[PDB]
Amino acid sequence: KLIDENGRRIDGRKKYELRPIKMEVGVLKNANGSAYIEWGKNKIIAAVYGPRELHPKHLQRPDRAILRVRYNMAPFSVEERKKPGPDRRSIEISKVIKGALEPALILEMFPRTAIDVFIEVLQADAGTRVAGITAASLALADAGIPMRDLVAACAAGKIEGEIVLDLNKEEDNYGEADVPVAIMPLKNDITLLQMDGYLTKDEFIEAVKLAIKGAKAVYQKQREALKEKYLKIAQE
Amino acid sequence: KLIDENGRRIDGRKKYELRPIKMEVGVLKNANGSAYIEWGKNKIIAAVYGPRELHPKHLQRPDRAILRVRYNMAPFSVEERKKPGPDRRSIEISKVIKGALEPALILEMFPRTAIDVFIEVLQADAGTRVAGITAASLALADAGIPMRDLVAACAAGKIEGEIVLDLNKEEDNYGEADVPVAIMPLKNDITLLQMDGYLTKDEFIEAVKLAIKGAKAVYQKQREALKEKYLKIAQE
Amino acid sequence: KLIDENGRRIDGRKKYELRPIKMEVGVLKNANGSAYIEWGKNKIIAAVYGPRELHPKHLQRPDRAILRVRYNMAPFSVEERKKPGPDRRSIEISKVIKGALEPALILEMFPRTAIDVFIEVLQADAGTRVAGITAASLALADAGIPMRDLVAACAAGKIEGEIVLDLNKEEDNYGEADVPVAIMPLKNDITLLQMDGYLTKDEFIEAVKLAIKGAKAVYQKQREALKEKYLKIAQE
Amino acid sequence: AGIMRDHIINLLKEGKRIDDRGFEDYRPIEIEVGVIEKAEGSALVKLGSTQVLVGIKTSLGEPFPDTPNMGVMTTNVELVPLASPTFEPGPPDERAIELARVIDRGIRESKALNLEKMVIVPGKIVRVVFIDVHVLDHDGNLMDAIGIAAIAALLNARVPKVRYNEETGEVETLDETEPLPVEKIPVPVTFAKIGNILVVDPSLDEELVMDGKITITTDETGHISAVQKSEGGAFKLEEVMYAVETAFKKAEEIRKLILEAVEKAKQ
Amino acid sequence: AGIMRDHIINLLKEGKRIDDRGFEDYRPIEIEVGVIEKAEGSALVKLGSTQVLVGIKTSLGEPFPDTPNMGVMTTNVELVPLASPTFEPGPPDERAIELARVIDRGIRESKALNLEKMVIVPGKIVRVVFIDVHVLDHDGNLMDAIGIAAIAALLNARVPKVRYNEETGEVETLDETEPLPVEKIPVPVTFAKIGNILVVDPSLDEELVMDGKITITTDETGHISAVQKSEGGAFKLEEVMYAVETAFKKAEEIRKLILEAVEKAKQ
Amino acid sequence: AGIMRDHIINLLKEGKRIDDRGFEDYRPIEIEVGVIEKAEGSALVKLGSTQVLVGIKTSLGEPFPDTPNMGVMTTNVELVPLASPTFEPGPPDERAIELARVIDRGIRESKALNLEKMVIVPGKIVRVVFIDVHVLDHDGNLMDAIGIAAIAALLNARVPKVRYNEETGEVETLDETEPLPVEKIPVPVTFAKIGNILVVDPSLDEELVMDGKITITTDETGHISAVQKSEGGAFKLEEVMYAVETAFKKAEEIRKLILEAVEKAKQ
Ligand SMILES: O=c1ccn([C@@H]2O[C@H](COP(=O)(O)OP(=O)(O)O)[C@@H](O)[C@H]2O)c(=O)[nH]1
Ligand SMILES: O=c1ccn([C@@H]2O[C@H](COP(=O)(O)OP(=O)(O)O)[C@@H](O)[C@H]2O)c(=O)[nH]1
Ligand SMILES: O=c1ccn([C@@H]2O[C@H](COP(=O)(O)OP(=O)(O)O)[C@@H](O)[C@H]2O)c(=O)[nH]1
Ligand SMILES: Nc1nc2c(ncn2[C@@H]2O[C@H](COP(=O)(O)O)[C@@H](O)[C@H]2O)c(=O)[nH]1
Ligand SMILES: Nc1nc2c(ncn2[C@@H]2O[C@H](COP(=O)(O)O)[C@@H](O)[C@H]2O)c(=O)[nH]1
Ligand SMILES: Nc1nc2c(ncn2[C@@H]2O[C@H](COP(=O)(O)O)[C@@H](O)[C@H]2O)c(=O)[nH]1
């Protein structure tokens, strides 16, 4: 009551429209690479260090860097103030973002090292994990880390009987399914795929196809954020 | 009201009868050794690893293996669902099971290593620590760890004014004393001895003597569990 | 209502009088150095170990010892039983006591080592951190650790409109400001300076000057505690 | 290890797997329900040598303020150090947390446990259901083993009949027991991608060499109630499509073994 | 590092600092208020390249038994690993705890947030104010950055008008919002002692070589509501005197930028 | 160390111990009660150079639902890093937890603190007793030092007279104080087995070489209320028998020093 009408959604988006997305790379001095993203009401910052000295050693891998990811929401990012510190949700998101970024990375290039991805959600409005993945790729590119592709991500979802792109909080709260997807778009390699909800097979596949188009759309934004950095560097 | 009458206990046992005990060795693929025990309503699994690489080093002992024990109850093992994770009781039981098993082990045989004993109580019904010790010895034997003896354990207790063998939950709950004892039976070496409750000296000594006979009874079960493994291996 | 009258405070002290202070050095067998202090209703014990083997290494500093401080209150030290373990207050006090003691220590004398300062408040009655610092210096001297000076500490405060020396619990509870100060008195080097409360500049400076005179007074007590140890050793 | 990736890859190129399973075969499955008889429900599931016990303990409690209208369900997976040299003592790690969450989402989102049929007094007193998963031996595919055992333990569950006394306001827990409102049977089916091949119910040896993993949980109604691509690697859309299809087929074969095990424990 | 202490010391002997600031200059300051629009108030403060975001989330809750007469305020500083290679994941460390406490004392002891004007039902229902400080980039002087952002977020704050219905006993949270009772503007000014020189707003490079640090928080009324000498080193009384004086002067320059930023976010 | 096992063993073969104690002697004992005067009760016990302080803080609280009929007692042992290079900062370790539990069992199971004489309103408001044990110097035999100090602190305890106002329902805490219902004096006596010899009150040096340890807690009535064989090693039945006998004898000698110390603090 009523998330689609007519056939406009609450903020005015058609079924297959994305929320306004802005992205900036190079927002932090300390981080090796960093990116900032406003995707809706999402405001997410992503930082990468380095490749660097893994501690502790016994973690090192002899042939490759490891990727460590930490997704965290600031207490003030959600409507109900969230007690600081991770929780089960943020730890599974870290895990799945890791599993999202790792296949883009050429980790055997930096043996015995860690590459550390931090994702801080400053404001949260559904889709933080896809937004985070997206800023994370850009922060990885920003860090000068060889990647086979960027990873772009985007969720699709089912609201009021209907498959839609890029759920907002409200629509995910009242929705019937949420399907984030991350891909490396050059090869259409799906590196994240989750489905929370209830869906038929053909509902689920359409959601995947759709969130991927959202992901390719996001990817164009990503490249444009890198272009804009490679123009900004080009002085002098 | 009334734990002994006449002179049958609630489940029908005479004062000096043990609860039905079944034991199997070799129940886990990953563990180096393992044993399973149904002692009453107890259902306890014990696993051993290895001797293995202690981490972290600074723990290693230059002349001997260390024994580490962890006794844990599954949330669903007790009548009131127990929050996962250890608690003071399970940590003192780990400590005292360790102190129970260690004198059976020839630890200077495996310097700089750890031998790790895990005891999981799947269902709990009084006497889990003696049951655990008993499965632990069998899992140690199962692991091929040289031992001077098995360690067998069993508790005796005071219910309705009377010294009895192998308290059940009910009888320990309403009882006046609980006295677990573990021994290495060949030499009658007492490796665990606890007394929770209130007892005169002669009440306490009789309890000890009795729980030891229960322990020698358990020990015969143990050997039989090993016999049955050394017959089961003997193919081909 | 009424912390000063006339112009006697609740326990009978004039504005610039200190609570009874007694100090003993060498109160522990295990500690490298130790001191005990009764400063009011404060009863605080301070222990030092050693310089010793830092673990873990990666903490070692190549040119100097590190100073680690731990200030802790026993559950039974405060009027409302305090749950064991540190809390934010005790952790900032550890931090600030560390920052208080460190400039007295010649840390490049013991590279790669830790010097560990423990402060246990056995009874608490305002001014535990200055009392602690004071016993800590004495425990450092007691440990044979080269120091450029003792560190003496003392707080001054504002109660009922007036700047006073060495607040008690009551007076700090109802007070308008509390200003602990620690100094190395030989050079008048201020190594701790905190102000909790609300004060004008000239109120704050007078508080500092005053707590320093209290600190020089405490310092004479300190030396006397060392004299008394260097007379006590002098047998035979 | 490492020497095994190659043997495994090469076997896979020849349509073979090291235990002679086909790409779509599960290992031998054993489900035994009601094995923890003090718990309200339980299930010991073996997927080959992988062994998980799931225990279901219910109490009565307050529902979440958000939802006065719904019982409580909470799922925890303990990866006990005894199950594996990789399982260490302490709070759940990210593996345990992802397993608990995906299994939970499976059941919660299919409403396989109907939380609405677990209200006693709206807003005040609901049935609270702990799904505690105790992994006893990790030999691969904990995801499916756990989901199978979670659901089968829920089906097994017999909780005390509770009644609101409208003359006293008392809540009377009765001796007589009753099933939990379990209305669906979600089953996770999980695939390991190795190279360009997906293989169902990966053993530990296949998990060590896999590129990535994807789990698809579906119920009898032909619905998906959880998907989780886990670990690294990447799947193709068509890989995912196949996996959803195959998962439905495997789920059904599994649900038959679950229900059979559930019914056996009533004989 | 180490090679830098010397360069820094030597520059300081010549009245210079490595970025050409004078001893009493702050780096360029940026304050932007109301940037987290879902929070009740927020402020992003940049002190050069140091960046802190502070978010203010309020709820209604019980006051502490000690104080039925007073709302609640609680301050937490997260030093997120992303802000710095020195920030590690986990509960606050002693740096985060000292920053949170000194900033809190600053505000609490000046009654800059009047907790008495935050009672709804005495002893029962008060306004609860979380000051959550999220450090996003540590490039020195987190103390001042955080205090500036804490206070500016408090000034920015617009919380839901709440009213006690004396006929129902209900507490009605209204759509309409209102400032927090923020009545002062404490500002920490912090000095690094390097050798015999104090320098205001130390950068990370100056923090690496400093002997010690002292922070002085003062408000518009000419009052000090916090002092904290932090780290090692020692100050002379006259160092402290100077710092209090200078701090008042710098605070005032800062409070002007804060209030300006606060007002900008209402345009 | 190691060189000491041998010296200790050899001395023991000659009926000697390194400080010239006999096998059944305690080190010099000092008990001083009421030393933390803000706590309800306290005791500083020295067993040679072992020093433990025990503080008893009571409040009023809810009894456990299981037991509306009984006050609360809870025992915690802090092994403060200052007491010993082996004591590290953090939550209790297994040594602290076993000491707290065995001392508690000692007192609880003898009903030395009668929890029934600590009800104020049945099911609702009971006396709550914290026995907080602060070990200040570990030089062996913490078990006995702690039990002696726990019991002596309980005997020392003077808690506020509380009364139920049956006209108001108020619970009035009165200025006037009263002993805790302490009705027995359990005393742990602890033996180190070294080789084939048991020696009472082991010092740290004897603890370093001991095979195992057994502690026997007994009261005035000739009852045992705790036994704990701790550490490794093994005892013979006759070792245990002897230890129980000897323990009763030593306990009695100790209880005299406790009661004497308790009475001294009333002069
Ligand atoms: O502690 C929390 C965690 C989640 N959320 C909200 O729930 C949304 C969607 O939930 P989901 O698990 O799908 O994560 P996301 O969509 O953000 O990736 C998040 O963006 C937040 O807006 C919240 O309010 N509080
Ligand atoms: O959290 C717990 C711990 C203990 N128990 C029960 O108390 C019994 C006996 O207590 P005891 O401390 O003597 O341990 P055990 O006899 O099992 O070795 C256990 O078997 C359990 O049945 C319980 O219900 N919940
Ligand atoms: O958990 C606590 C911590 C503090 N205090 C009391 O508050 C006093 C003064 O507070 P402050 O923060 O100024 O520390 P101190 O003056 O002791 O150095 C302490 O001595 C204690 O008496 C307390 O009762 N309980
Ligand atoms: N509403 C409600 N939630 C509970 C209750 N017991 C546990 N939970 C929830 O279920 C989870 C189980 O946590 P545990 O009780 O195992 O520590 C917790 O995260 C908690 O939020 C209860 O009685 N009522
Ligand atoms: N009285 C009261 N105190 C609270 C409330 N919420 C948080 N606090 C206090 O503020 C701090 C914030 O902790 P958090 O809620 O962030 O974990 C806690 O230490 C707690 O004491 C509340 O609703 N009422
Ligand atoms: N029933 C009841 N138990 C308490 C109370 N305070 C503490 N306890 C119990 O005593 C122990 C002491 O814990 P602490 O309060 O020291 O953290 C806890 O494990 C807790 O169960 C109380 O007020 N009422």
Swiss-Prot record, chains A, B, C:
Consequence of changing R81E: Does not affect ring assembly, but abolishes RNA degradation
Primary subcellular site in the record, as a coarse category: cytoplasm
Gene Ontology, cellular component aspect: cytoplasmic exosome (RNase complex)
Effect of R129A: Decrease in activity
GO biological process, one term: gene expression
Location of the protein in the cell: Cytoplasm
Keywords, alphabetical: Cytoplasm, Exonuclease, Exosome, Hydrolase, Nuclease
Gene Ontology MF: a single term: 3'-5'-RNA exonuclease activity
Documented EC number(s): 3.1.13.-
InterPro entries with a match to the protein in the record: ExoRNase_PH_dom1, ExoRNase_PH_dom2, ExoRNase_PH_dom2_sf, PNPase/RNase_PH_dom_sf, Ribosomal_Su5_D2-typ_SF, RNase_PH, Rrp41
Quaternary assembly: Component of the archaeal exosome complex. Forms a hexameric ring-like arrangement composed of 3 Rrp41-Rrp42 heterodimers. The hexameric ring associates with a trimer of Rrp4 and/or Csl4 subunits.
Stored NCBIfam families: ECX1
Chain's role: Catalytic component of the exosome, which is a complex involved in RNA degradation. Has 3'->5' exoribonuclease activity. Can also synthesize heteromeric RNA-tails.
Family indicated by similarity: Belongs to the RNase PH family. Rrp41 subfamily.
Name listed for the protein in its UniProt record: Exosome complex component Rrp41
Organism name: Pyrococcus abyssi (strain GE5 / Orsay)
Gene: rrp41
UniProtKB/Swiss-Prot annotation, chains D, E, F:
GO cellular component: cytoplasmic exosome (RNase complex)
Organism in which the protein naturally occurs: Pyrococcus abyssi (strain GE5 / Orsay)
InterPro entries: ExoRNase_PH_dom1, ExoRNase_PH_dom2, ExoRNase_PH_dom2_sf, Exosome_comp_Rrp42_subfam, PNPase/RNase_PH_dom_sf, Ribosomal_Su5_D2-typ_SF, Rrp42_archaea
Quaternary data: Component of the archaeal exosome complex. Forms a hexameric ring-like arrangement composed of 3 Rrp41-Rrp42 heterodimers. The hexameric ring associates with a trimer of Rrp4 and/or Csl4 subunits.
Function: Non-catalytic component of the exosome, which is a complex involved in RNA degradation. Contributes to the structuring of the Rrp41 active site.
Cross-referenced Pfam families: RNase_PH (PF01138), RNase_PH_C (PF03725)
Coiled-coil annotated spans: none
Keyword field: Cytoplasm, Exosome
Primary localization class, coarse: cytoplasm
Keyword Cytoplasm: yes
CDD domains: RNase_PH_archRRP42
Family: Belongs to the RNase PH family. Rrp42 subfamily.
PANTHER family per UniProt: EXOSOME COMPLEX COMPONENT RRP42 (PTHR11097:SF8), EXOSOME COMPLEX EXONUCLEASE RIBOSOMAL RNA PROCESSING PROTEIN (PTHR11097)
Protein name: Exosome complex component Rrp42
Keyword hit for Cell cycle: no
Single annotated GO MF: mRNA 3'-UTR AU-rich region binding
Any one GO biological process: rRNA catabolic process
Intrachain disulfide bonds: none
Compartments in which it is found: Cytoplasm
